[PDB]
Design an enzyme around this catalytic site. Structure first.
Site, PDB file in Angstrom:
ATOM      1  N   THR A 108       0.827  -0.818   0.135  1.00 50.16           N
ATOM      2  CA  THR A 108      -0.139  -0.032  -0.003  1.00 50.16           C
ATOM      3  C   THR A 108       0.869   1.234   0.024  1.00 50.16           C
ATOM      4  O   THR A 108       1.903   1.188   0.436  1.00 50.16           O
ATOM      5  CB  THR A 108      -0.849   0.130   1.288  1.00 50.16           C
ATOM      6  N   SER A 109       0.351   2.437  -0.465  1.00 52.91           N
ATOM      7  CA  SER A 109       1.033   3.647  -0.267  1.00 52.91           C
ATOM      8  C   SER A 109       0.931   4.111   0.867  1.00 52.91           C
ATOM      9  O   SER A 109      -0.212   4.056   1.732  1.00 52.91           O
ATOM     10  CB  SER A 109       0.143   4.653  -1.148  1.00 52.91           C
ATOM     11  N   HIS A 131       7.570   0.178   4.239  1.00 54.78           N
ATOM     12  CA  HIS A 131       7.199  -0.676   4.784  1.00 54.78           C
ATOM     13  C   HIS A 131       8.562  -1.813   5.244  1.00 54.78           C
ATOM     14  O   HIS A 131       9.450  -1.283   4.680  1.00 54.78           O
ATOM     15  CB  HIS A 131       6.526  -1.677   3.635  1.00 54.78           C
ATOM     16  N   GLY A 132       8.055  -2.551   6.250  1.00 58.80           N
ATOM     17  CA  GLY A 132       9.228  -3.382   6.331  1.00 58.80           C
ATOM     18  C   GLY A 132       8.747  -4.575   7.110  1.00 58.80           C
ATOM     19  O   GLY A 132       7.695  -4.813   7.671  1.00 58.80           O
ATOM     20  N   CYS A 187       7.530  -1.602   9.789  1.00 59.16           N
ATOM     21  CA  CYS A 187       6.981  -2.490  10.653  1.00 59.16           C
ATOM     22  C   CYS A 187       8.492  -3.590  10.573  1.00 59.16           C
ATOM     23  O   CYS A 187       9.279  -3.621  10.071  1.00 59.16           O
ATOM     24  CB  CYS A 187       6.115  -3.365   9.948  1.00 59.16           C
TER      25      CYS A 187
END
Lengths: 240, 4, 240, 4
Positions: free
Chosen positions: A34-35, A93-94, A135
Site C-alpha cells: 500500500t501507499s 514498509h518493513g 514494521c
C-alpha cells in the site's frame, strides 16, 4: 593543559555530517504494498529537524531496492573526514531485519554494513545513526491500563519493538517520527541522545493509541526500540 | 492510523 | 559545525595558569601577631592539590606587606595569554577586607585590583580566583543544634563569613583549606566549581567544632563564604 | 584549634 575527559563523541568537526532520508511512499503495483499516506509529513519534519541540527540533509523519494543499495554504497564511499557523524533515516514498509524498496525488500544489514568501521574509514570512531520507521513483523501491542569492533559506534533507533507492527497516521505522520522530531526540537541543545530517545519512547508509549473500525487493529499501543552499539555519549551541540 |  | 554553547569558561588553553600561594606563618615581633601553627600543612596540601589540577604552583613564605604587593604587581604584569585562569591563595592573619604581611596589613582590594579586567589584559575574560584563609573580624558562631565590567570574572572563596573569626588547627591545618583540598581532590574531575565550594561549605559547617579550655572560644562553628562575580561555569577539566 |  588541564585534566581532560573523552566520554563524548567529538562533534565539532567542520560539518555535523550527512542526513540521508529515504522516503518510500509509492510502491510498484506488483509488490502489493500500500501507499504510505502520511510519510511526506514525516519526511518534511525530519528535513527541518535535522537542518536545524546543521546536518547536510538529502531527501530521496520512492527508491527501488537497487537504488537504495547504490545510494548507500555511494554515500559510504564519500570522504567523511570533515564530518562528525552520519545519519540515515528509512521510511518504508518493513519486516524484521528488512526495509522495502519500491519494488522489493532490502536487508537492513546490507545497508548498514557499508558503514562498518573497516569499510568506511572516514567514519571509523564516529557515530552512525540509523533511524527506522517501518514494521518489524505483525504483532500488535494490546497495552495495559589496537582495534575497535567493526560493529561499534552504530545506533539503530527503531520505531517499534522486534516482531511488531509500527503505526503511521495518514494525517499526522508516524507516531515515532512525530515524536522524535518533537523531542529533538525541544532537547537537542540540552540532553544526551539516549536521553532524548528515552523521552521519545515515553511519548510514543503514552500519547498514542490506534483507532480502527477493525477490532483486530483497534486500541493498540507501540513502544520504540533503541539499539545502541555506541561507545560514547552523543550531544548534538558542542562547547565554544 | 495505518501499519507500515 | 553544529550548534555551540558557551556557558563555561574556556579551560583548554595550553596552561591552566598560575597558583600563587602566600603562606604567612611567622610575623615580626613588633606586630604582636602570633605564629600560625598548622599553616605549613595547609600550604603543602594546596601545593599538591593544585599541582594535580595542572596549575603552575608558586609557594611563597613569610612575605612582608611590601613583598606581597610587589609580588602581585609583578605577577599581574606577566603575559597570561596562554593560561586559562589565575589562582591566588592567601594564608595569614586578617580582618574584614585585610590580610597581613609579616610586618603589617595589606588591603585585599589592593591585591585583587592588579588583576582587574582593564589592568591585566591577558586575564580579561578569564576566571581569577582568590582563596582566603584569614579572619574577617572577631565574631564567633555559636551554632545551633562592547565592554565587560572590570570587576567581572573574580571569585573570592572566603574561609569564613563576614565579621567572623576563622579557625586553624595547629596539627591538621585550617578547617577551610583542609576541606577545600579534600573536595577538589574528590570532585574536580566531576563537579562545577561552585558546587565543589558548596560541598566545602557543608563539610566545614558540619564536621568541625572548636575545642577550647576557654569558654569564650569553645564549641564554636564556622561557615565559609563564596563570593562570585564569575560570568560562566568553571570546570577544572575540559573535553578531549 | 586557634583563630587567624
Amino acid at each position: 593543559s588541564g585534566i581532560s575527559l573523552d566520554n563524548s563523541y567529538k562533534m565539532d568537526y567542520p560539518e555535523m555530517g550527512l542526513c540521508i532520508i529515504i522516503n518510500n511512499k509509492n510502491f510498484h503495483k506488483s509488490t502489493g504494498m500500500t501507499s504510505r499516506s502520511g510519510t511526506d509529513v514525516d519526511a518534511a519534519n525530519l528535513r527541518e529537524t535535522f537542518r536545524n541540527l546543521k546536518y547536510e540533509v538529502r531527501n530521496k523519494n520512492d527508491l527501488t531496492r537497487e537504488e537504495i543499495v547504490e545510494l548507500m554504497r555511494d554515500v559510504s564511499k564519500e570522504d567523511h573526514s570533515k564530518r562528525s557523524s552520519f545519519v540515515c533515516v528509512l521510511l518504508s514498509h518493513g519486516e524484521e531485519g528488512i526495509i522495502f524498496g519500491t519494488n522489493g525488500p532490502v536487508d537492513l544489514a546490507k545497508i548498514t554494513n557499508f558503514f562498518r568501521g573497516d569499510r568506511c574509514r572516514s567514519l571509523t570512531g564516529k557515530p552512525k545513526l540509523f533511524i527506522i520507521q517501518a514494521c518489524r513483523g505483525t504483532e500488535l501491542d494490546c497495552g495495559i491500563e589496537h582495534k575497535i569492533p567493526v560493529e561499534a559506534d552504530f545506533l539503530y533507533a527503531y520505531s517499534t519493538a522486534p516482531g511488531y507492527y509500527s503505526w503511521r497516521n495518514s494525517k499526522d505522520g508516524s507516531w515515532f517520527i512525530q515524536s522524535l522530531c518533537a523531542m529533538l526540537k525541544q532537547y537537542a541543545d540540552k540532553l544526551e541522545f539516549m536521553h532524548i530517545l528515552t523521552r521519545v519512547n515515553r511519548k510514543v508509549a503514552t500519547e498514542f493509541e490506534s483507532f480502527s473500525f477493525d477490532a483486530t487493529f483497534h486500541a493498540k499501543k507501540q513502544i520504540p526500540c533503541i539499539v545502541s552499539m555506541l561507545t560514547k555519549e552523543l550531544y548534538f551541540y558542542h562547547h565554544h | 492510523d495505518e501499519v507500515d
